[PDB]
């Protein structure tokens, strides 16, 4: 679907999601681009938790919405 997602190096790529799509089955989309260390690694929109079992729709997220990750520039 059309999605804009935003990395750690400020790329862009797109991310495909089905109807009925869980946060953790979205976990397998996400590792397309190079498997993503971080584990806290989530969207900062209505605070919504990607470790949770929630799934996008629940959230009235569809396609085109406003999805914006964290950087994970500091590491701790």
Do not use: C, W
């Not at 996400?30 to 993503?36: F, P, R, V």
């Not at 406003?66 to 520039?73: F, Y």
């Amino acid at each position: 679907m059309q999605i804009f997602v935003k990395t750690l190096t400020g790329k862009t790529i797109t991310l495909e999601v089905e109807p009925s799509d869980t946060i953790e089955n979205v976990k397998a989309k996400i590792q397309d681009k190079e498997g993503i260390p971080p584990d806290q690694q989530r969207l900062i929109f209505a605070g919504k938790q990607l470790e949770d079992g929630r799934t996008l729709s629940d959230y009235n997220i569809q396609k085109e919405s406003t999805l914006h990750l964290v950087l994970r520039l500091r590491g701790g």
